[PDB]
Amino acid sequence: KTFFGQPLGLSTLFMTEMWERFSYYGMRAILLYYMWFLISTGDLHITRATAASIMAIYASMVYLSGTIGGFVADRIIGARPAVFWGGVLIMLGHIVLALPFGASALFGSIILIIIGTGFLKPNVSTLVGTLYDEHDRRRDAGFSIFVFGINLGAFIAPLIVGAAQEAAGYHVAFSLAAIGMFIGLLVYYFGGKKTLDPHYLRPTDPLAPEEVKPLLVKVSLAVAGFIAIIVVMNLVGWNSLPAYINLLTIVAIAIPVFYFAWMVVSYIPLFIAAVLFWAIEEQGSVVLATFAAERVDSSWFPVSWFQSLNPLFIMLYTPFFAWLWTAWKKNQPSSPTKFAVGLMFAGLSFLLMAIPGALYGTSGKVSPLWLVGSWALVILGEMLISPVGLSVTTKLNSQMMSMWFLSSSVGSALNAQLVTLYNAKSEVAYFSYFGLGSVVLGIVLVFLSKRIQGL
Ligand SMILES: CCCCCCC/C=C/CCCCCC(=O)OC[C@@H](O)CO
Ligand SMILES: CCCCCCC/C=C\CCCCCC(=O)OC[C@@H](O)CO
Ligand SMILES: CCCCCCC/C=C\CCCCCC(=O)OC[C@@H](O)CO
Ligand SMILES: CCCCCCC/C=C\CCCCCC(=O)OC[C@@H](O)CO
Ligand SMILES: CCCCCCC/C=C\CCCCCC(=O)OC[C@H](O)CO
Ligand SMILES: CCCCCCC/C=C\CCCCCC(=O)OC[C@H](O)CO
Ligand SMILES: CCCCCCC/C=C\CCCCCC(=O)OC[C@H](O)CO
Ligand SMILES: CCCCCCC/C=C\CCCCCC(=O)OC[C@H](O)CO
Ligand SMILES: CCCCCCC/C=C\CCCCCC(=O)OC[C@H](O)CO
Ligand SMILES: CCCCCCC/C=C\CCCCCC(=O)OC[C@H](O)CO
Ligand SMILES: CCCCCCC/C=C\CCCCCC(=O)OC[C@H](O)CO
Ligand SMILES: CCCCCCC/C=C\CCCCCC(=O)OC[C@H](O)CO
Ligand SMILES: CCCCCCC/C=C\CCCCCC(=O)OC[C@H](O)CO
Ligand SMILES: CCCCCCC/C=C\CCCCCC(=O)OC[C@H](O)CO
Ligand SMILES: CCCCCCC/C=C\CCCCCC(=O)OC[C@H](O)CO
Ligand SMILES: CCCCCCC/C=C\CCCCCC(=O)OC[C@H](O)CO
Ligand SMILES: CCCCCCC/C=C\CCCCCC(=O)OC[C@H](O)CO
Ligand SMILES: CCCCCCC/C=C\CCCCCC(=O)OC[C@H](O)CO
Ligand code: NA
What stretch or stretches form a coiled coil here (predicted)? Predict the structure, then answer.
């Protein structure tokens, strides 16, 4: 007996992640509109631009947090408690928004979810690995199934949580996100005790006695430096929310920049390609979400439901490309070539979105099929770059590996700056330029492709 050919324990981790992703993308699909609401009532004193900026830097920090949680599990608390307590923090984050507060609860929610996801996300993925002996051929299949559970959660949550929001309001919808994580904890806790190795209740590489102090010194100096920067910021009068967002942008970009400088050259165009690609892919929940609400005739259905298109297309495309990369025996494109083309599709997905405004004006409303087409194109690009991203990075070590996972944090950090440029007046130029820019850089990478596959 198996779960799709895999060890039964995969079913537990599959459902754990399904419900965690349910809670996350449920929250994400209505959080921008929530902020709009809070602005409209005078409760939240920011612009819509800044609110878009918040969505982006929020994602950036969630990704950054994720590149840290593995270390914390492996060296300090253990992967199994990391997933558990991570999930508890996430749940608390959604409960905070379900409570009868307004703008004042936003920051606490965000911090809880940033920390919680940093604990849970890398570490569930680690427990999936543990189901398999070192040389088990099923490993890639198992991970492919696990990812399907991720995508399934991402897909149903906007539908269910978005509907809930429109029927019963924001607080009830947010409480549904909390309940989703709770279900995931239930299944995780009781299902985990049945199938997971007891070894992973503890760190597998605990800090040695002489490793504790230098770690403490490092963290302490980092916190002190960060705090000192904020202090100087407030002294020189740079203390608005955009300023704080800018500080976080700089931190998220500085981190790979320093890693590069420390250290490879061949990787820079690949990494820049990844960054730009994730930028465009992460704007679906921000700029495309805005377009959905403002420019699409969606009067008969919740506009949050558009956020389901991204994981729908991932799910549709995935078995096809799985087959494709095996069927394509002779002259399959190299990984650098995949990045190039992947970025070109991202670019096409924005170029497409420039058409309706150019043709019809930006004052009216256009068909939902423009967005459907846009997501169709960007996910095509995702199928090209995502499955080879870690591989091409690895084959070109622990720090640079993380830079691949960092690419999406950097992409979102960049978004925190760019999405503030988006509005009805700039819509066509915005989609045109960043669309065109991505295509062109994709063409640059094609030129560089031969040199790179060589190295
Ligand atoms: C096999 C790989 C290709 C699959 C992805 C390609 C899909 C690209 C679609 C772009 C065109 C869709 C936009 C057309 C559109 O907006 O229609 C509006 C019109 O139908 C209603 O007024
Ligand atoms: C309305 C508050 C009363 C609820 C009692 C407190 C429990 C509430 C939330 C716990 C969150 C994690 C639940 C996951 C779980 O299965 O807990 C396992 C627990 O039995 C470990 O011994
Ligand atoms: C050495 C590797 C560092 C990686 C940094 C990641 C980003 C790399 C290049 C920046 C991409 C384009 C930046 C956005 C841009 O062009 O701004 C256009 C301007 O209109 C915005 O005000
Ligand atoms: C397997 C696919 C490989 C072929 C990909 C070739 C790239 C295809 C089309 C590039 C279209 C670029 C046109 C952009 C454009 O018209 O911009 C106009 C806009 O900037 C006006 O301000
Ligand atoms: C503040 C509300 C949340 C309170 C949560 C209930 C706390 C009760 C018991 C703590 C459970 C600790 C479990 C740690 C853990 O690793 O669980 C993993 C499971 O053994 C499966 O791997
Ligand atoms: C290693 C990751 C740890 C970094 C955590 C820092 C991230 C903290 C906040 C993310 C940026 C959110 C700023 C917007 C925000 O908090 O909204 C607050 C309300 O708008 C108050 O007006
Ligand atoms: C070292 C891991 C421990 C993680 C602890 C994270 C703590 C983050 C936030 C704590 C406060 C969150 C709730 C704040 C809140 O409920 O807002 C209501 C008040 O009106 C706030 O102004
Ligand atoms: C251990 C609890 C984990 C389960 C998640 C907790 C969610 C429990 C109950 C949800 C209650 C949410 C109240 C919604 C609410 O406040 O409605 C007020 C609205 O403003 C009125 O339309
Ligand atoms: C925002 C504050 C971040 C929280 C600090 C993170 C941890 C900071 C320093 C590392 C201390 C970790 C505890 C060390 C520990 O318990 O391990 C014991 C050793 O295994 C015994 O040899
Ligand atoms: C945000 C400010 C910087 C944060 C500093 C985090 C400090 C938190 C805990 C430090 C604990 C000091 C290490 C001693 C320790 O915990 O090891 C005990 C071992 O378990 C005994 O073998
Ligand atoms: C390098 C690790 C240092 C720890 C990073 C955690 C940083 C926590 C918050 C960063 C600043 C975000 C503040 C957002 C905010 O609410 O500002 C609003 C102001 O209070 C009013 O304008
Ligand atoms: C030796 C390092 C010292 C500097 C650390 C790097 C971070 C420096 C500045 C953070 C960026 C602050 C941007 C402020 C800003 O955007 O203008 C102010 C607001 O727009 C309006 O209040
Ligand atoms: C299991 C397959 C289910 C696939 C459908 C999932 C629905 C997800 C998002 C719905 C987004 C709304 C699309 C609107 C639409 O396509 O309508 C086309 C008509 O031309 C509208 O005028
Ligand atoms: C078995 C895998 C291969 C199957 C290919 C699946 C492609 C299915 C639908 C793609 C639809 C393409 C949209 C056509 C299109 O964009 O035309 C635009 C028209 O000008 C709109 O008036
Ligand atoms: C294999 C990946 C490539 C798939 C590309 C197929 C799509 C080809 C052309 C789509 C061009 C988009 C413009 C469609 C358009 O404007 O139609 C006009 C509509 O009637 C406007 O209401
Ligand atoms: C293979 C599928 C291709 C789908 C995307 C191809 C679209 C190609 C070019 C679209 C760029 C449209 C730009 C329109 C534009 O910028 O004109 C500005 C007008 O003056 C309106 O402000
Ligand atoms: C198993 C292989 C995966 C095949 C999935 C096919 C999805 C590919 C492209 C979907 C593009 C949807 C846009 C629909 C569209 O533009 O049609 C135009 C309207 O019919 C005009 O009235
Ligand atoms: C040596 C590589 C490091 C270069 C960093 C890569 C990203 C470069 C710039 C980020 C884009 C900054 C544009 C800011 C912008 O357009 O407006 C910002 C908003 O209007 C206010 O926050
Ligand atoms: Na609607």
Answer: none
